Design a protein around this nucleic acid. Structure first.
Ligand SMILES: [K+]
Ligand SMILES: [K+]
Ligand SMILES: [K+]
Ligand SMILES: [K+]
Ligand SMILES: [K+]
Ligand SMILES: [K+]
Ligand SMILES: [K+]
Ligand SMILES: [K+]
Ligand SMILES: [K+]
Ligand SMILES: [K+]
Ligand SMILES: [K+]
Ligand SMILES: [K+]
Ligand SMILES: [K+]
Ligand SMILES: [K+]
Ligand SMILES: [K+]
Ligand SMILES: [K+]
Ligand SMILES: [K+]
Ligand SMILES: [K+]
Ligand SMILES: [K+]
Ligand SMILES: [K+]
Ligand SMILES: [K+]
Ligand SMILES: [K+]
Ligand SMILES: [K+]
Ligand SMILES: [K+]
Ligand SMILES: [K+]
Ligand SMILES: [K+]
Ligand SMILES: [K+]
Ligand SMILES: [Mg+2]
Ligand SMILES: [Mg+2]
Ligand SMILES: [Mg+2]
Ligand SMILES: [Mg+2]
Ligand SMILES: [Mg+2]
Ligand SMILES: [Mg+2]
Ligand SMILES: [Mg+2]
Ligand SMILES: [Mg+2]
Ligand SMILES: [Mg+2]
Ligand SMILES: [Mg+2]
Ligand SMILES: [Mg+2]
Ligand SMILES: [Mg+2]
Ligand SMILES: [Mg+2]
Ligand SMILES: [Mg+2]
Ligand SMILES: [Mg+2]
Ligand SMILES: [Mg+2]
Ligand SMILES: [Mg+2]
Ligand SMILES: [Mg+2]
Ligand SMILES: [Mg+2]
Ligand SMILES: [Mg+2]
Ligand SMILES: [Mg+2]
Ligand SMILES: [Mg+2]
Ligand SMILES: [Mg+2]
Ligand SMILES: [Mg+2]
Ligand SMILES: [Mg+2]
Ligand SMILES: [Mg+2]
Ligand SMILES: [Mg+2]
Ligand SMILES: [Mg+2]
Ligand SMILES: [Mg+2]
Ligand SMILES: [Mg+2]
Ligand SMILES: [Mg+2]
Ligand SMILES: [Mg+2]
Ligand SMILES: [Mg+2]
Ligand SMILES: [Mg+2]
Ligand SMILES: [Mg+2]
Ligand SMILES: [Mg+2]
Ligand SMILES: [Mg+2]
Ligand SMILES: [Mg+2]
Ligand SMILES: [Mg+2]
Ligand SMILES: [Mg+2]
Ligand SMILES: [Mg+2]
Ligand SMILES: [Mg+2]
Ligand SMILES: [Mg+2]
Ligand SMILES: [Mg+2]
Lengths: 183, 52
RNA sequence: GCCAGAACGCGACGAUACUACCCGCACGUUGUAGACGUAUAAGAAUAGGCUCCGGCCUCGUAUCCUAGCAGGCGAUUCCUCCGCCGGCCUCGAAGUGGCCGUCGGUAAUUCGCGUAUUGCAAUUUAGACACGCGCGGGAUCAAAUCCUUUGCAGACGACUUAG
RNA sequence: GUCCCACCCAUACCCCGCCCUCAGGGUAGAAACGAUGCCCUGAGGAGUAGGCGGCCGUGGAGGUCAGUGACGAAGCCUAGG
RNA sequence: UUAACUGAACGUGGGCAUUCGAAUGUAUCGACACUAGUGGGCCAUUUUUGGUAAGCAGAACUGGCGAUGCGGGAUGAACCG
RNA sequence: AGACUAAUCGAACCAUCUAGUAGCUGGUUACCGCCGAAGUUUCCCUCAGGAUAGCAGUGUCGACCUUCAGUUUUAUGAGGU
RNA sequence: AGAGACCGAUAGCGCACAAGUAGAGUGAUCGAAAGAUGAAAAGCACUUUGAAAAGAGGGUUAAAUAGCACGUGAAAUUGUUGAAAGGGAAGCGCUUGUGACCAGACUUGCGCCCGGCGGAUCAUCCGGUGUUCUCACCGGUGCACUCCGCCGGGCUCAGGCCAGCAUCGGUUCUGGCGGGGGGAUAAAGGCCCAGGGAAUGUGGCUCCUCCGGGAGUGUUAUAGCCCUGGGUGUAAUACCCUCGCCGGGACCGAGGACCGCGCUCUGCAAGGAUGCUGGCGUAAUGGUCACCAGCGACCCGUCUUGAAACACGGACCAAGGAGUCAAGGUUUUGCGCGAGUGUUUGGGUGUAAAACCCGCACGCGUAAUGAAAGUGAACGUAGGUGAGAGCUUCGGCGCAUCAUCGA
């Protein structure tokens, strides 16, 4: 006997994509080579985010990009391993260059109409094989309707599972002091 | 590919400790004590020993 | 004393056809809880014994036998040791030993010829009992069951009887 | 009752081989690779109720082997591989 | 708040490894999501309640059997290894 | 006599509602690999049953965060066996 | 009337057949089993045995191993033949033995030299055509020391099964020998020097017995013993610790060009076994089965704290036999589009239940909060502080997310 608390412990993180996209497999082969033959920490981060599922790759809009193009980042290259969407609230688009996994049709048209350019993640590896003069951006992970229901309980202020909204749907006993108690 | 044991294989011992050959050649494990006529127990160490 | 009698315990006796039996020879188509010098007889005491009558005993750490082509062929030499037969005695706990005779073999001494080639190891195929087969000689000419019958017996078999 | 030597054997301990599981590395100016492959290194392996992974079989459907077959398809028997 | 810029909380600027201020390990850090089975237990050293007592009935800390083979106790769920 | 009403009577026989309901007994079909329990808390016309917390598996994500610990040491509190 | 990713005779309707039939009940009502010779009956003429049913011959057929008890013809259970075991169950696990039966492997291969035989045309150059643009193919030349094939002879190397010896590597068991250190620098002890004692009193002296002896007396004499110092002496030996050197056995050989650390450095025992030799080339090694032998081995499924249980189900075999489908929720994986998204209620069209095309409404989402009348999201570069991957002109900028103060 050896008296060990743990044995045959498996890793907690993904080691390959779960998708079967043929072109995503070509992209993964490229960045496996780059991460092994370069010392840049940038390349290792991009490889890991290519394994992730869609709820771990939330979208990023043009407004969120414009917020981070201030205070001396006007001429860096924006890198987003996700979809880039359009924002109707933003009326004037600044000029920029962005490398993204994919663009929506209107997002791509507004970037180029302001004098910018759009790249693919394989075009980025050819121009910046070490990730120099770049900024990495992520979208909001918790801005999902399902996360509002997590951890429901007393004195937690979370969202309940109900079939409708109105006065007759879970508002009487346990929600106000005029009927028993409150939460 | 195969661990070999010094204290049985002399070539391995010389690889790890180049002073081994000198130690054996000069017989450093058989050094004699310094000369000198020794005194005797001072006649009261012996009295206490058999005291009771 | 009295009842049963091991259905895988034993003894004595009678008659034994069928080569079933006996003797001799030669083979293996064979089996064996396991040959390889398968060598050794006093009785008794243990705080006492043995003896050749001189002595001797912790001790079988003994005694016998033991050489030669897996053991040849001759000589020199010796009168020892071994075996198959035959004749007399002897042996009863589950039957054994001794004496004598003919015949065959035989380094206690010393030699002459032969050994190879199984190739640098491979069980040293070797003993003793059983059994089978084939010859050549001797000896021998028997019973049991069914069946019929009895009632000293009996569910049926079996049993006591007669033909 | 107390003390002292030598010896016997567990799936336990030590060394070696092989299987699997987990972990960590190498491999493109490609004389290059079932890159889902190959090469190097270390540790681990008991299990009911229960959870997950990978694989083997059966009846039908699309595609493909320009597949087998009356010179013998399918089925059945076989101390033969 | 105090008679009172006197205090109370939160700070700018500056100084201090010439040593970030016991030992050992790190053979397994943090946070989240979804769900299975279970909800009759029993045994033992020490401590303990009722009972004359019980292979009786009831508790505390820890270790076991249940869910588990192997070497010992001839046998022997729980004892020794 | 709760007796008899076609071997049927303390409420006949036949078809349908009907696959009537069961906190209760019985069964529930190939292989290998890795991890691995509970009989305890609170509430219930609750005591052979449920919900709820714990114990277990699987999927991940954040950094590979000087990060932790069924342990010792040093200083300093509480307790009525 | 047309069809199907439906079932294939214990299935599919109760019924693929003279099936709502045969049969049961007074009656209302209940209600089965049962498909397949061969292409064609060519469905066995004649002889013989038997009372007959039938048998034996002889015919038909591609086949009677298809004869109306009819395609194929499994298991439970039974007969004959063959092999084997058995002293109050049998069956099973590990490991030898005997008997029977059996799959592989091996039979040669490449190379060099010598001779014979046959055929070409080997190298080079000229013309044409391809192609990876320098590499090839076809036609012509070549014409015996070149090229190709066969046969004969010799030589090296590699090759199948089981074993023996020598030199090494890894692990381990077990004998023997040479040194060093320590303690009261072992303690004792032998020999020598000086002092002091006694008795289980040596020799002498006395008494008792001659009957072997005994009893007194006293300090080394004709034996000896015990204490205390000193010398040889740093004596020896035991015990504990430690540095090396020689023998004897057992099990194992993973890896496959070189590369490294080293040494006793023409080389080697240094990042894992080679060299030499014999027998046999097949049932010899090896495998399957049956049986005897040594050791081991309680009947499965299930409920249970506890099952081999005097706890329940199970005589045997074949075929059937149990977490499914729909609507509505939820979390997680893959995919399309993305502030939007969803053609298919319907219309157009068609090679016609397919595939293709169209867009008015509508659903979910884009805004909340109150019982309701109602009202309705920027002081600031969409705020300040502490952490924070990544980038950086090295001054800093700071995603996601967490804690905190505000709007
Ligand atoms: K009220
Ligand atoms: K001779
Ligand atoms: K299938
Ligand atoms: K003030
Ligand atoms: K639960
Ligand atoms: K529960
Ligand atoms: K109970
Ligand atoms: K009890
Ligand atoms: K036991
Ligand atoms: K009736
Ligand atoms: K109940
Ligand atoms: K007290
Ligand atoms: K039927
Ligand atoms: K009738
Ligand atoms: K035919
Ligand atoms: K015929
Ligand atoms: K047939
Ligand atoms: K040794
Ligand atoms: K000494
Ligand atoms: K002395
Ligand atoms: K005297
Ligand atoms: K290895
Ligand atoms: K049961
Ligand atoms: K039973
Ligand atoms: K989904
Ligand atoms: K809409
Ligand atoms: K940073
Ligand atoms: Mg282990
Ligand atoms: Mg008898
Ligand atoms: Mg396991
Ligand atoms: Mg089907
Ligand atoms: Mg066939
Ligand atoms: Mg069979
Ligand atoms: Mg229960
Ligand atoms: Mg109790
Ligand atoms: Mg009880
Ligand atoms: Mg249980
Ligand atoms: Mg246990
Ligand atoms: Mg045991
Ligand atoms: Mg006992
Ligand atoms: Mg009646
Ligand atoms: Mg049902
Ligand atoms: Mg019912
Ligand atoms: Mg485990
Ligand atoms: Mg109630
Ligand atoms: Mg029950
Ligand atoms: Mg972090
Ligand atoms: Mg980590
Ligand atoms: Mg108290
Ligand atoms: Mg139809
Ligand atoms: Mg039928
Ligand atoms: Mg039917
Ligand atoms: Mg039929
Ligand atoms: Mg006939
Ligand atoms: Mg046929
Ligand atoms: Mg029949
Ligand atoms: Mg038939
Ligand atoms: Mg049969
Ligand atoms: Mg048997
Ligand atoms: Mg030519
Ligand atoms: Mg060795
Ligand atoms: Mg001395
Ligand atoms: Mg000395
Ligand atoms: Mg090898
Ligand atoms: Mg040979
Ligand atoms: Mg054999
Ligand atoms: Mg047994
Ligand atoms: Mg019992
Ligand atoms: Mg029951
Ligand atoms: Mg029964
Ligand atoms: Mg069927």
């Amino acid at each position: 006997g050896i008296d060990l608390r743990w044995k045959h412990v498996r890793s907690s993180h993904r080691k390959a994509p779960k998708s079967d996209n043929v072109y995503l497999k070509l992209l993964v082969k490229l960045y496996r080579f780059l991460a092994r033959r370069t010392e840049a920490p940038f390349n290792k981060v991009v490889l890991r985010r290519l394994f992730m599922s869609r709820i771990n790759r939330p979208p990023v809009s043009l407004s969120r990009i414009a917020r981070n193009l201030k205070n001396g980042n006007e001429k860096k290259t924006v890198v987003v391993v996700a979809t880039v969407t359009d924002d109707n609230r933003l009326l004037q688009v600044p000029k920029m260059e962005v490398a993204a996994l994919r663009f929506t049709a209107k997002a791509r048209a507004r970037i180029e109409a302001a004098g910018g350019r759009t790249l693919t993640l394989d075009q980025l590896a050819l121009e910046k094989p070490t990730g120099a003069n770049t900024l990495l951006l992520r979208g909001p992970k918790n801005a999902r309707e399902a996360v509002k229901h997590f951890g429901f309980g007393p004195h937690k202020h979370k969202k309940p599972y109900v079939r409708s909204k109105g006065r007759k749907f879970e508002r009487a006993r346990g929600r106000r002091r005029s009927r028993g108690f409150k939460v | 590919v195969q661990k070999k044991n010094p204290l049985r294989n002399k070539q391995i011992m010389l690889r790890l400790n180049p002073y081994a050959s000198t130690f054996a050649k000069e017989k450093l494990g058989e050094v004699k004590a310094e000369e000198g006529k020794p005194p005797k127990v001072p006649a009261s160490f012996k009295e206490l020993l058999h005291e009771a």
